[PDB]
Every structure is written in C-alpha cells, then in structure tokens.
Amino acid sequence: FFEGETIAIVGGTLIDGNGGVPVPETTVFIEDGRITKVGSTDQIEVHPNIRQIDAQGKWILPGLVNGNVHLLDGIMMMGRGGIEYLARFEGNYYKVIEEAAQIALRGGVTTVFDTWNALEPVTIARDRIASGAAEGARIFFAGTLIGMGGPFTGDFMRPSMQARTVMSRTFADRMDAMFEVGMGRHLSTLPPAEVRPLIREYLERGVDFCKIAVTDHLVGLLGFRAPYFTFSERVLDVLVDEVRRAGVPLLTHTTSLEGLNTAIERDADLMIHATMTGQAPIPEETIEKLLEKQLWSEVQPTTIAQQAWMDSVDHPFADFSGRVHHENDVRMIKAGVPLVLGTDAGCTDPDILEDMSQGELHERPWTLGEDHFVWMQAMVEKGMDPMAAILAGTANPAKAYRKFDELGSIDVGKLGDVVVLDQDPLADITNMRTLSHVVKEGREIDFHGLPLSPLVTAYPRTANVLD
Amino acid sequence: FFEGETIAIVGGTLIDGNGGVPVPETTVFIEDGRITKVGSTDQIEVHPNIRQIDAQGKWILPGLVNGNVHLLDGIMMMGRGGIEYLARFEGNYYKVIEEAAQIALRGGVTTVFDTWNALEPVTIARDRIASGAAEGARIFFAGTLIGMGGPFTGDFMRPSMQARTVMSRTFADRMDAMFEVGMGRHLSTLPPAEVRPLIREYLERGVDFCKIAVTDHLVGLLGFRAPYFTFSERVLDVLVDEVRRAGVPLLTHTTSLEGLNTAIERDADLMIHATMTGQAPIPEETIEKLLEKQLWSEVQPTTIAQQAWMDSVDHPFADFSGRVHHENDVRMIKAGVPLVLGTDAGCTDPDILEDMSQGELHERPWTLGEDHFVWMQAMVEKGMDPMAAILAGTANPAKAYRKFDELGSIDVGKLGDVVVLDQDPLADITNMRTLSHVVKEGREIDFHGLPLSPLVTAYPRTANVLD
Amino acid sequence: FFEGETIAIVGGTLIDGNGGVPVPETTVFIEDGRITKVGSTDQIEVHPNIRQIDAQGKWILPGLVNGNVHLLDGIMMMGRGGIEYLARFEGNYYKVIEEAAQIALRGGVTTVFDTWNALEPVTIARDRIASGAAEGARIFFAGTLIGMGGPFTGDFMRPSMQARTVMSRTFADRMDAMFEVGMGRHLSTLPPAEVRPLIREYLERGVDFCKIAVTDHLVGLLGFRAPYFTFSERVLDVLVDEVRRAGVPLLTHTTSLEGLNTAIERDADLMIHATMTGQAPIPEETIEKLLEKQLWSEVQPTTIAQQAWMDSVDHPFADFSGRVHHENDVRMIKAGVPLVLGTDAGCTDPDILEDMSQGELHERPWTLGEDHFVWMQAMVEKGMDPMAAILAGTANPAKAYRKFDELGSIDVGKLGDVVVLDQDPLADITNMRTLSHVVKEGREIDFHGLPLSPLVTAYPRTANVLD
Amino acid sequence: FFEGETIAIVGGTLIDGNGGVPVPETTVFIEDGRITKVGSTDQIEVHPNIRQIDAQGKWILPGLVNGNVHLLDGIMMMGRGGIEYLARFEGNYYKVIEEAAQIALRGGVTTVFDTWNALEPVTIARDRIASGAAEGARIFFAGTLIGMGGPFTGDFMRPSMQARTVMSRTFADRMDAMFEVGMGRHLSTLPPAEVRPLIREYLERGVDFCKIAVTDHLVGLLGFRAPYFTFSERVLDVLVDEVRRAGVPLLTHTTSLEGLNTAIERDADLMIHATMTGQAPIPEETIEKLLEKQLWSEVQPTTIAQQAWMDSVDHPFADFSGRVHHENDVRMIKAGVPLVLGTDAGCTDPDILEDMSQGELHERPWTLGEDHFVWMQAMVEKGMDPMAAILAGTANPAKAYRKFDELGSIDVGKLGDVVVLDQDPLADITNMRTLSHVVKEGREIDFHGLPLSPLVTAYPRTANVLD
Ligand SMILES: [Zn+2]
Ligand SMILES: [Zn+2]
Ligand SMILES: [Zn+2]
Ligand SMILES: [Zn+2]
C-alpha cells in the first residue's frame, strides 16, 4: 500500500546531521527507500526518468526526529479534557495515533519516539505505518511508564481536578487498564522477586524501549517541589537488569536532583526532562558526571515569551520549565552536555485548544507538529548553537535510542528520510519552519494534505449528522 | 417508509382505558392506522386475508403512555456520566433519542412525553418517527425547562461533582447551549418586558408543550430542603400568559409546598413531581384545591424495595421519593386526586449501569423501558387501585396533554395503538410486564428486536475497531 | 461606668447634616449627652470650667453613621477564614463585637447598623455599650437575615470552598444555629400559616429592625447572574405584615431587578445593595418609582482603583460592584434618588488580611473603620456631590432607620455625637479622614487608643503563652 | 514542685515485666522515687509511718508504657478538625500536650513516646513534667517526622478534604512551620551534602529520638496501595549516619514491603506500623530477618469489632489495619518477632468525637487513655499470649527506646512506676482495665481526678462567657 521509493534531491546546501560545515551544490540519491549516494551535484548523474526535487537555493536536512511525544495526548490529560477525549474516540484510538503521527510528519518529523501511550493501539498503529498500510511518521514506543498510574489516577489529578468524581468507575477503570497494562502504582507494593517476572513479561510484549518512573508523577497534585522515589534501589535494580537483558534502550523519568543522579548512575540511555529537578539547581558534580559518562539528556524548555505568559497568569505549570529549571537548561547548554530534543507534545483536542488565550497558544511547547520548532528556538534563545540544536533534533535522538545506524543523518546506507527548507536554519533557527518538501524512505509526501482523515482535528463538531 | 396499517385483535378481554368493567370476548378492528370497530368477537366479522392477532385468553389494553421521560438521559447527568455520554454520542444525538424511543416501545409504550431534552435533536427525532422514517414510540416534547441551566451548570452539580472543573469550557458551553437554547438561568435577571419576547420566540420554535421551572433545580447541590422560586410572580405571569397565547399545554416543575400552590393557582395542565415538596407534608387545603380544580399531578414514586435500598446506603436521592414524599404519594392516592404516570426515566449509559449494585438496579425508577411497570407497582403498593394505575399510564397523560381525542384509549376513531398481555393486570399489576404483542397505528411491532441499531446500548465497548 | 456628658465645640465651620450651606464661626454646646445650643461662636457663652474643644480653622460634623456593617465579619465568612475565626473566638463573641464597634468609633462612626450577626452576642454587646458598661459605637441590629442559611451553609460556600468538608459537623451545626436562630433556609419549605408564628416569635426576641432575604444569597456558589426568590409572594406578605405589626423598620436583601422591584412594592424602609441586580441594568421605571415613593436605597460601591485591581486579577467578587452595577450606581446618583451609606464591612482577621496583596487592601470596601471614607470617595468619583455623600453617611441612615429624632444631625435636642475634621470635606471628600476629635453623647473619645483590648486585632499570635 | 517519693505496695501477685511466672504474696518497696526492694511480703518489713498500698488479692505491674502517641492529635488532623482545633488552642499548645499526658496517666501509662508533634510545645511540656512543675506521664519525643509535610500539606489531605482551600494561607503556613521546623517535603529536593547540616542542626535542638519518613505519608490522598520512598538511599544514609552520630534511637515510618526491608537493613531501633505494607503480605525472608537481627517492630492493630465496623461502612482507613495487614499481624505474633505496643493515639477534640457513631467509638484504636487496653485486647484476639502483650506494653518499648535501665519493669534500682489491678490480666486481658492504683516515682496519683485542668476536654462549649 506504501513503500520504499526512488528519488533524487538535487543541487542544495546539505546539512547532513553529522555537524560539519554545510556543503553546497549537493545531491542526495535515494533508491528503494535507502540512501545510495551523497555528493557533488555534478558527480552524481541522474537519469531524467527518475523523480527529482529541485533544491537549488535550498537547504537539505535529514528527516526530523522527535525524542519524546505522546500520540494519545498525555499532557492534556494532566488537566482538563481526558474524559471527553477518551470517550469521544473509544473504538478508534489507533486512528487517533495515526492522525497524530501524520501531524508530526506534516512538520517534517519522519521519526517519533513515543514515551507514554496505551500499548494496544500504539502497537496497532506503528505496525500499520511500518508496513505501509497507513501514513505517518514512523513510530517507536515505550508503551507505559513503569510504575506510573493511568490517566484517572492520582498521577493526573490536581487538587481541584478529579476526573473520577464525575465519570463512571467502569469507564475510568477500563481506561486506566489500557494505559497501565498491569505496570501501574501497585508495582511499588511488591518485593523484588515478584517484580522481576512482571517487568520481563511486559518487555516481551514488544516495546522498542522502556521508560521507568524513577521518581513520582504527582506534580499536578502536589506541585514541583515535593518529589518521591517510586521504587527501592533494589527493585529499581531488578527493573534495570531486565531492560538490559531484553536489550532495548532504557529511559528514565526524573523529577529531582537525586532522581537525576540515580538515573545517571544506572547509565540511562536517555533521561527525560533531566533538568526538571524540584526547582533546585543542578550541582556541578552532576554536570561533570554527564560529561564524563557522555549520557544523553532530553530537556523540555519554554521560550522567553511562553514562560513570560505563564508567569504572568501564575500558571500551575510555570515551574515545569521556568525559574531554576530554565537556569539548569542554560548551564547544561553552556557546559556542552549531550542533548536530545523532546517535548511531551500531543495532538491536542480542538475543544481544549479553543479554550486557550493567545498567550497560551503562542509558542506552546506541547502542540504537536510545531513543538520541535519551538524547542529549537527556545534552546537557541538560551545560547544553544543553531547547528547543535538541529543535531538535537536529528542525529542525537537517533543515537540515544540506538537507531543511528538507520536514521537521523544523511549518509549512504541509511533510510531515505529528508526534508528541504527554503531558508537557512543556521542563519535563523526559526527558518526550520520554511519546509518545502518532505520525503520518507524516498517517497515524497503531500505534507500539506495531512492528516488524511481528520479525526480529533475534525472541526467544528456538528451535533446531528444526517447521513 | 412506515405507516398506518390494518389489523384485528380478536377475542380477548378488553380494558379500554375509560375505567369501566373489562369486557370479555372482544375484538378490536383497526384500519389504516385508526380504530374502526370495537365489539363482541362474534359480531365483528373479519375476512381471513386480514392480519390478525389471537387474543384468546388474553388482555387487550391501549398503547401505553409515559407522561415524563428524557430521551437524552437527564437523571444520569445529575450525577456521573454527563461528559462521557455527551462526548461519545456528539453527532448522533437524534439517533440516541430514537434508540431510547424504541426502548420505550419495547416496553409497550406507544407514546412518550419528553419533558427535558435538547430542542434540535428531539425535533429531528420526533419528525422522523412521526413521518415513518424511523422506528419508535411517538414523541411529544417541551424542549427545555424554562429558567433552568444546562447540564454543565449549577443545576446538575453536586458538592463533590463539578464537571466543569475537568472538561473544556468550549465543550461545556456548546452542550449547555443546545439544551438551554437561550432560556437558561439568565432569564431570572431580566424585567418582564424583556422576558416576553424571549418566551414568545421560544414557543414559536415548535414545541408540543412548555415546562416552566417554577422552583429551582439545585437538589443536587443543596439537597431537597432549601428550595427557591426561579421567577417573580409578575414574570411568571408573563410566561404563563405567553404559553396560553401559544395554545400549548403548560407544565410545571415544583419542589416545594409553595411552589406546588403557585402551580395550582396557575391552573397548570400537568404538574411534574407534584409530591416533591421540600420534605414537608402537603397540607389538606392543597389537596382540596387539586380535587376542586381537578388538575393533573404527575408523581414519581419509589417501590418499597428500591427505597429501602436507598435508605440503607444513605443515598443522596433518598429524599426524592422517600420519607415525607412517600407519605404525600399515599395521601394523594387515598384522596383520589387525578394522577399521571411519569418517571424522569432515560436510557442510561451501560458504563454507568455497570457501576451499580444489585440493589440500585432492582426496581430502579429511572430505567427507561421498565420504569412504567415499576411506577404502577409502586403506586399499587401504596394503595392505588390497579385500574386507576392503568389509567394513569394510558388515558390520564393523554388528557393532561390534550391528546385524548387521538390516543390513550381504545375507542372508535382514535389511533390504533394497542398492547396485548398474557395475564391479568387487574389481578396483579406486575402482570403488566406479560407483553405478547405491541401494535402502533395498526402495525404490529417486532418489539423483541428493538432497538434496531444499538448505539448507547451497544456493549461491550471495544477500544480499537479494525474495519 | 460611661455616660452622657458636657462639652463645647468652639469656633468651627458647621456642617450640620441638614444639607444647607456650612456656617462658619459656630459653636456647639452639649450638656448631659444632649445638644442644647448651636449658634455663632460669640453669642454662645461658655464658662472656662467647662470642657472644650477648639475647632478654630476646622470643620464640625455630626457623629458619622454606617447603615450596614457586620460586627462578626460576614464578608470574610463568604471566603476563607470562617472556621479559624469562629473557633478561635468561641466564648468571646460579644467582645469581638465590642472591639469591632470600637474600631468603627475610631473612624468617627458613633452609630452602626448591623444587618447580619448572631443574635445572642450582638444583643449582649449592644446592651453593654448602650448602658455604658463597654466602649464603642452604639449598635442597632437585625440579628439574622430571614431565610438565609448560616456560615457553614450553601449561602457561604464557593465551588472550591466547602468548609463542612473539613470541620466537625457538631461545630458547624452549633455555629449555624447561633446565626440562623431557627430562621434559616427551612423557612422556604413551609406554608404561610406555619411561617407566621416563627417570624412573630423572632421579632419578639428584641431586634431593632428586620432584614428579609427577598432573593437568594448564593453569589459565592453560583456567581452574580443566576438569582432566585427565597419566598413566594404570599409568604413574603406574611413576613412583611409581621414586621409592620412589630413596628420596626423593614430591610431587604435583593440581588436582581425583580427583587428590587418587589422590595420597592413593599415600601421597604431600607434596601440593601439595591444596585446589585444580576448584572442587568436598572430600568428607568424603577428609578422613577424610587423618586416617586422616596424610598431609601443603600448601595455598596467600589472605587476606581479597587475595581481595577479586582478586574485585573479576575476576582470572583468583581461583579459585586463592577461593570453594570457600577453604571447603576452612576445613574442612581445622577437621578438624585435617596441614598444611604453602607458597606457590609467587618473587622477582618489579621491572618486573612495578611494573605492579601497591596492591590486587594488598597481601598478595600470591607475594612471596618475606613470603609465609610472609601464609600464616600467612591461615590464622589461617580459624580456624587460631596455634601450629598456626607448626608448619605450621617442624616440619611438615621432617617431610613427612623432614628433621625435622636441622631444623624447637629440640632438642638439631639444626641451629642460630633466629629471634628482638620480639613474641608466639601473641597475634597478624602478630607473626611482628617479626624481630630471624636465625641459621643458629649463625651470626648481617646479614639487613637481604640480598641481598648485587642482581641481579633491582637497580633502577632504567639504559639505558647507562658502565664 | 513534684518529687520522687516513698511508698510500699504490699502483698500482691507480682507481674514484673521480665516475663517470668508471676510471684504471689509479693511486696515492692520504693524509696525516693527508686525501687529499693522486691520480695516476699513477710521478708520485707515496712514501718507503719510509711505510705502503703494494700495489694492483697490484686496484681502488681510496672508502670504502663506507650510506644507511639501524639499529644497534639495527629490522627484527627488526617481528616476533619485540624483547623478548628489548632485555631482554638493557639497560645496553649503546651497545656494541650500536658492534658493529653495526664489522660495517658489516667489509664496507668507512666511513660509515653511521642512520635510526631510540634517541637516547641512538646519540649516545653516534657521539661515541665520531667522537672515536676506539671503533672502527667513522662514524655520522650521525636519532634517531627523527617521528610513529612505539616498538617496543611498533602500529607494530611484527602481528595475531598483540603483544608488550605478554606483557611488563611498565613495561618496554614504558621502551623506547618511549627510542625515541620525546616524538615518538611523540601528535603526530598536536596543533594546529600545540603541535607547533612540540616539534619545535624535539627538533632541538636534536643530530641530524644528521631523518626524518618522512609516511605511517604499520602495514604489519605492516594489510599494504602501506592507507596513511595521519600529519599534516595544515599540521602537516607546521610540521615541515618547523623542520627547515629547524635546517639539517639532511630525510628522509621514505613508503609510498604520494600520500606520495611529498607528499615530492617538500617537496623532501626523501632519500626513504626511495621505491618502496614501496602496491603501486600510480608514475605517469610523478612520475618526471618526480624528474628535473626532481633529488631523491634511496633504494630497498630484493630479489634475484630472495630474492624468489622470499619468494613461495614467502607471506611477509608479500613486498610490501615485490616485485610492483609491483619494477617501480617497474625503471622508476626505467631512467629514470635519482637513486638512493641503503640497506637498513634491522641486526645481527640470533643466536637469531633461528638460526630462519631457508637460503632466508630467502640474500641476506637486512637482514643488516648484506653488505646493501650484496646491494643492488648486486639493482639490477644489474634493469638498473642497475654503475658507477651503485657510486655509489649511495658518492657519492650523501654528496650527499643534504650530506657530499660530506668523503666519498663519492676526491678531494684529502676524508677518507682507501678500500677495495681483488681483482676488477673493473665486470665483475661481486658482485666488490664481494672486499675485500682497508679504510682509514678513512688508517688501515688489521684488518677480519677485527671486531667487537672480540662482544656480540649472541657465540654460543652459556651458561646459567650460572662466573667
Ligand atoms: Zn514525565
Ligand atoms: Zn423536574
Ligand atoms: Zn446582602
Ligand atoms: Zn506513620
């Protein structure tokens, strides 16, 4: 239904993802989904019966890569909207996920790493996209967050927002079960010997990586300054050992300095929102460990304007990326630690978007399809080099997730994922938005026609459809 | 698509709805939807090419009639479930309504009076059923309750249940608007001259009757013992006058003794839950006014077992029909005031039903399709004569709503709505459940095959339908 | 213990409360609590053994008068603080009330009209002040608001503030009982014949006037735009008749246009927050009735700055005096209706004050002891004539409450209540604050030494007092 | 002011606390507060000028000892009442504590170990009782729980009970600060090097022991089945080291199996509610470690009747000691692990007691003064030997807290704390209630006249005290 194809991208300035000086007048040649040639425009011969893109005056980048998204919108579920969204789309969750993957693809993102979702529909969706039955960014997933509750649990409550008080217990339980898949808060009650088979079995269900709740996920209920550990070190060791045994990358969720340190000491492949540290500044010693061990940190910043908006309305999530966490971000960049782009972004329900002010929407970090552009902009505002920002969004996630042999740069033998921009992203990082062409496994995408069948994005919503 | 038809019901004991002694060996003849003959079995000749029902050894009753239902389930929305239900079925509300009408029909109810619903979809649905485009009990409606808020308002809150705290404001506003249609709480803020055109315009939209919130609808928030008037008497006079001017019946919602008195003094055509009086006993004078004026009261009782269950778990709605309101019911029956069957019943979402204990489900007053049986049973437990109960569920509503010229009894010239029971309802009122045949405008109904397309009743609910 | 005394106020500009041109070089002579002479400084001889105040270059006004205060702080109880305050001072409520009366006196207010309080302690306190056993402004009271719930009732809840969820039921009930004294929400459930003896008995307990909840008091729970009537017109007629029969003035609490009209049609002696009308504009007809009938309206405005602060933080009480209610205030002033000064003000617990920003505190309308100054300022900002503002705070309340024979103006035979200001209130209404001297029944008050025994105002609060 | 004194307890059956067979016809001789002689009645000569108690036909036990109480009532604060209680008694907290210590003494408890309280008032109170300035059981205390929030924090919330929503922030903060004393939830955000001086400084304030929140205290918010660790193992090591360095016993608060294990691995001196384990059964290995290391566990059980009441009303705390935790209690007793009596009991405000049903009050585990009797009864119902139960309430706490050299048994040289019972506690453990005499340091107590000055127990509460 969809497949690896053949195409040539001709005569543009190449920014290949390996970090070097950009090379003008370059041609990239893709054959049956795989890059076969990269070189000077005139040394690469291209017969006229071959599909081509004219890149003259343009910039050629690898397919963009997002290290942390949620294709069922989890950030939304930490506030209002969880009930209405999950009820509205029950029966079609896999299509919601495909739609969200298409929206990522529309922003030039050819690979997404989904860090929290419901196992069943995310599996269905990735398999269909991978096999060509459906359109979208390719997906790799964790499934659930080991040791976290589902969306109708304390982990997604706020003091004045308690979904269970106004919804059926039956529906709330059914939803929690499809997210948790037995790997919820109850794990914290168990001895190591009982945890071992559960995590092993979970891993044998078919995840691409595993994310562990090293610390708690109660920021909504308790704020950002009272973190806990989910597990004893002993039980954490069991989890880590089983992930290593399964041979998939290990991710961590950490909410405190001690959490961060603990993650580092387990040589985590990728540390999600590493700079979110209980509003306490990251010590020098910890930064030095990151440098010495060369571990990947993902960070989730906020632009100057977005944060200023948040601060102006005393928003409950102002602490997420502001104040001390902002300063952490700055110091991390400055020390040159290895950084990965990720956003927690999702395809937010239009009824929920519709509630938001201009200020809330403007450079919102959690709006899938543009969240990566905003991340790059925010990082550069804090002193990140534009080239390093691009790598954070291309090569760096791929490496962290051990997929760099296949994607994240333009290199012979790798997958044929490419985007073409009209303006220079190194001169101005906001030029990342100037997408002209999107290609996935050598197949050009009609990216402006995405998503193919609006589902959550279908709007407005008519009360009585006569058929 | 569906129509008036021809049929004969032969050789049964006739209980015609006029309250006389039942007449055995009777035949009812219906031609093109209208009753043409009623008489002794042997005097009514019926050619063998005519469709027939053998009512030998059986009882023949008029099509059953419910004086107060909600085809979008309003009682549910006074607790948990409002968000999930309205979100899940947005785009199909008219089909939800039709499904609910079919469920009523399944219980032998050929006419329903819907007292609170969303104007747009209930209009669509009644027009489709009335024109034969869709199956179900025929519908007459009020639209909204004048002066009451919508489902995401204070009128449907409880102290610990505040749907707006966890749903989008946009969605909540859209739902409130489709129920309120400009006739919400803001009416109480206006002077009489500004109220007049609003109510007039509302009535011009095409309702079959009009129900006014004489008293408040804050039982959920404030309990049953702190009632208010919605309007000044002056403004109430405006509303009554415009209803009279439009020439449709006038219905009241009342919740206190003074509210009841006020309704009576306006010669209301039908008084909904007349016996719900702030848990204060109805005075003798008020009962005498009902007798003297001969006004119709609908009442909503609870069976002995259901109420005992409620009292046993200290249920927040125990006060709805229990204690003093139960006594009020008894005294009304005893004094022989004119009584109408009505239940506030709706087709409740299975996820919400699935939360309930045996005790909660057993003789639940709000379960559409059986609610009328339960009403009759409850009324008889409190001393009502079985024949008078049957009339409450056939003739009386039809009279109150000024439809007795067309339905509510078996009489030549009236519509051909009939049910056939296997056992004697006068011997035991629970025999009302022994339905063998259901006929609507001379057309026999496959009542066991209803509803035709389960929508809200479709269950279980699969997460990912592959199509 | 304290008494009527003799004193002379010499040689000031007299503003006597009767509204005329101020008369310079005036002397006021008080003997045994009563004003005996008012005239030209040189015509009034004063022996040197007589206590005197030199009002040279100063202004002489009558004792100031507040038409609506709460000496147990009710406005506070509509938000946070009710539990801690009532528990902290249980055993001493009468002293709390005395302290508050002293604080009013400190601001030059010699007479206060308390419109909602607990009957037992407010009785004890007024009797002790009236007899001279205790210091403070003299008090007249309503006791409770007929048909309103107590402070742990729905009448003082907000959606997110529900004191009963975190306090003992026993304590909540004991507090509700001391405010309600049987005249709470349950009155709305009763027939007229049962209401009559209750209100009659209540009036026999010894109130100075009676305030009826014509409309509801659910602004905290439901906002300002969904008002109700508490009582049927029939039951309201009973209450009004019994008040008339008891021969005390009649006050109303109203919250809507219709409520206001209804109060007018009952010839209310004083209508509390008359301009609070559901955020709908007062019609011309209604203003004309006020003029024609010459009824007294109290209004509760907000200053430009205070309201701007409220609007800037989207405060839940912004609607109390803002937007349309502000415009009502302007039109009432412009049309020259009779206006009375009143504020709902109380002596707010310092722990609650301590929570407040500068903007909240600045020109706060509910801060007893300065609330009258702020009222005058606010009214003048809206176009009121300074002289008319002074009358609103002197003569006008006295008339509404039928006490003008004894207080509210400087006139021979009236009580010797006087204040002396250093600057001209007619030149600038903020000069009302320039108090130099305060006199009550010819007794000069050390007003800066008030309150005599700080109780609620005692601050800071030490954890362990070693005695 | 109160002193060590001289007395002889003559001719009773001695149960000395060392666990041996009881010895009849025994006399105990105390001189200047200290036990000097214990032996056969006829070998111990006692001059007639010496104060004596006739223990003929009676039983002589050591002064009873409670290993876990809260002299400001903390259990209460986990539900309703916190605001009213702390506001009502501010200024007298030390006296509240003394009163509570006297109530313990009234039940024969001469020594209480307070495991959570506010440092300042508990210090005041113990010093006064220890010196003889004030009456009561002697007190040893932890102060706060290291890493737990105060009473207006998440640690004492429930989903529907959020005190901060209805009280002043200023008051809430002031109360949280007097309980937390800088050792609250923020500690979880710090690195080890910053924690070290804080804990050291805390320990230098003068506590008798130190209790560490190994696991969380969110049972109210989240239930009993989702526990967390408060600290990293690294930070926990810092805290333990500093406690050891200060030379005071180490207590742990644990709430899961892994928490229990962790506490065991730190050789905790006493483990509070050791059997409260996330409703998961304690593994055999863990029980073996307790046996092998001989560590003291306190447990908090519930009687058959109390637990049956809880289960019958679906009480939120049913999980505290019921189901699996009840079975843990049974197995711990059966395996003979070292057990300490403790209850979390407090002197509960009478307004809160007044809310409770008979069932709630009957064998309530948290009612100070009887809680120890109920503990012993509950433990025996689960198979504990009556002698071993008596030791759990005398000798065992003393040993755990390293006070056995001075108290907890009748032995020459130890303090003269003794109680005398009229019936045999070994025949029937409920006979522990048959107290005839109470002696503290050789001084007989008028136990029935305690507490000396009712403060919290003063009842009823009058609104307006005229003095
Ligand atoms: Zn996270
Ligand atoms: Zn109704
Ligand atoms: Zn008012
Ligand atoms: Zn504990």
Numbering used by the authors:
A (entry chain A), B (entry chain C), C (entry chain D), D (entry chain B): 30 to 496
Quote what the paper states about this structure.
So far, there is only one described microbial system able to degrade molinate to innocuous compounds: a five strong bacteria consortium from which Gulosibacter molinativorax ON4T is responsible for the initial breakdown of the herbicide by cleaving its thioesther bond, releasing ethanethiol and azepane-1-carboxilate (ACA). This reaction is catalyzed by molinate hydrolase (MolA). Following successful identification and cloning of its encoding gene, recombinant molinate hydrolase was found to be cobalt-dependent, with zinc and manganese also able to confer activity to the enzyme. The structure of molinate hydrolase consists of a homotetramer composed of two symmetry-related dimers with a 67° tilt angle between them.
Good diffracting crystals of recombinant molinate hydrolase were obtained in two distinct crystal systems, orthorhombic and monoclinic, with 4 and 8 monomers in the asymmetric unit, respectively. Later on we solved a crystal structure partially loaded with one of the potential catalytic metal ions, Zn2+, by co-crystallizing the recombinant enzyme with ZnCl2. The position of the metal ions was determined from single wavelength anomalous diffraction data collection at the Zn absorption K-edge. The anomalous signal was modest but the top positive peaks in the anomalous difference Fourier map were located in equivalent positions in each monomer and were consistent with metal coordination geometry and with the position of the metal ions in structure-related amidohydrolases. The Zn ions occupation was set to 0.4 and the overall structure was similar to the one of the metal–free enzyme (root-mean-squared-distance r.m.s.d. of the superimposed structures is 0.22 Å). The active site structure was also not perturbed by the depletion of the catalytic metal ion. The catalytic metal is coordinated by His282 and His302 (residues are numbered according to the recombinant protein sequence, including a 32 amino acid purification tag), which are hydrogen-bonded to the main chain carbonyl groups of Asp245 and Thr283, respectively, as well as three ordered water molecules. The water molecules are in turn hydrogen-bound to Lys240, His246 and Asp373.
